[PDB]
Design a protein around this nucleic acid. Sequence first.
DNA 1: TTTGCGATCCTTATATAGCTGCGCGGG
DNA 2: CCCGCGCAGCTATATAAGGATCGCAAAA
Lengths: 302, 177
Amino acid sequence: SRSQQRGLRRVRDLCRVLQLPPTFEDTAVAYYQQAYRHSGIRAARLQKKEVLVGCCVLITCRQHNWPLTMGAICTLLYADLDVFSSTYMQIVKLLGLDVPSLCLAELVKTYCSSFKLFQASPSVPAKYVEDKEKMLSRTMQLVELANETWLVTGRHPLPVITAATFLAWQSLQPADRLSCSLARFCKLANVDLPYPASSRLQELLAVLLRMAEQLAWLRVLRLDKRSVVKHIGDLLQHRQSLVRSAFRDGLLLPPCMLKSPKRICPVPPVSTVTGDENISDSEIEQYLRTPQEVRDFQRAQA
Amino acid sequence: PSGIVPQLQNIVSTVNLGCKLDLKTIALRARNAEYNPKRFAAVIMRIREPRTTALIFSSGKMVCTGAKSEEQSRLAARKYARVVQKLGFPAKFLDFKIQNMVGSCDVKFPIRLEGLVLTHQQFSSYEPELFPGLIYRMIKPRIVLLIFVSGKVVLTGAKVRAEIYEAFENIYPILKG
DNA sequence: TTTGCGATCCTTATATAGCTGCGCGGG
DNA sequence: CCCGCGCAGCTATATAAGGATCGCAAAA
């Protein structure tokens, strides 16, 4: 098939653009071929055949823990994420695959290293320059803390890492970096600001404030989302102990649970309808236009 | 048992009025009809009690959505049929069938979806880059469950009320343990 | 600027149905 | 090089769930 040969060529070009190891190309080509054998794929639009290229490369990457995001693939392929979503779910179901989940540890390393904060420039002053290894180590500890304290489950993973990278960077020199906002930080580090990153930051700061309450010398300081930043180093040194202690007392739950105002969901009253009761003429006539309403509507459309 | 009863939220039912219909006539002569043939080929009709929506097709076939009980869905379907009859069409009430039922629950405890997709992978699909819920495809009964981090569960794909209750009693020990 | 709130989209099931994209067979 | 067939999915209806991501407007 001319559309199959074009597809296999696109698969190989995507792997080379992404600078993937040599073994990946073959596996992704084999998945596209396996996919083409099914009539549901053969009958799909040329737009679905374009995103199918990406699905096969993503599955290959997921099996080798290569941290490729679905958003990044869609950006390279100039594709709609919703079109990619339905094609990926269909092909995983069709090939009967157990695709591993995105490897957060590998995504922290890749994404965090793209933050251009390791050398001074007119847009990155000397006080904003940070060590790459100190950054990665603290970002990872903050991503593991977010995962342990229910801030990652059901959410997009990249805004969580953007918020953890910013907090790692600020906490490494608090006196000189607390004036910098999340939006200014992403701009100088030359990274796009993901919309949910602000919510993740605030949730992560609230989790560190709960931990601070477990240490008597930090509890007495009545810390806030700004003053807690200089103690992040101390809190992460004892993250395992402080998390166990925080769950042990009271309350640490997914943010969507704390809190929901509508405590009672069965608002419609219990019914005594049988489906067999008489339907009166007056009950039906209320849904009918009068001859005058009809004439007035007809004249208005003429 | 769990002591938790899933609540029915929606019933999708179908019925054949057994006659061809002129949708332009229904749209012009009813008060509760919405018809944009360029956008969608059916008439969208709404009644206040039971509060539902019906899609009426020129073939005489009809879809009824939004009812909270199988009894309410039948009464609503009969009311749409009676409105169509009064509009001058020889409508009948043939082959009424409940096609889908949606139930909802709260187990009132958080769920580690990332763990559930590993222990029950053969039924689970969890892709947080796409959707926040875990899609659980139960085989017996054949029900799709959307499981959220909050412990809130959505059950769909049922033809009878018992399939919703059976699927929830099956998922509860999986979620608890 | 910076926040908060509300509206509208995503997912699942399910029927209804014409139009149309897409490739595989026959002819 | 067309014709029919069998898929695919576009418009739409409802409903729960939680997240994303807009617009918009108000305190900072």
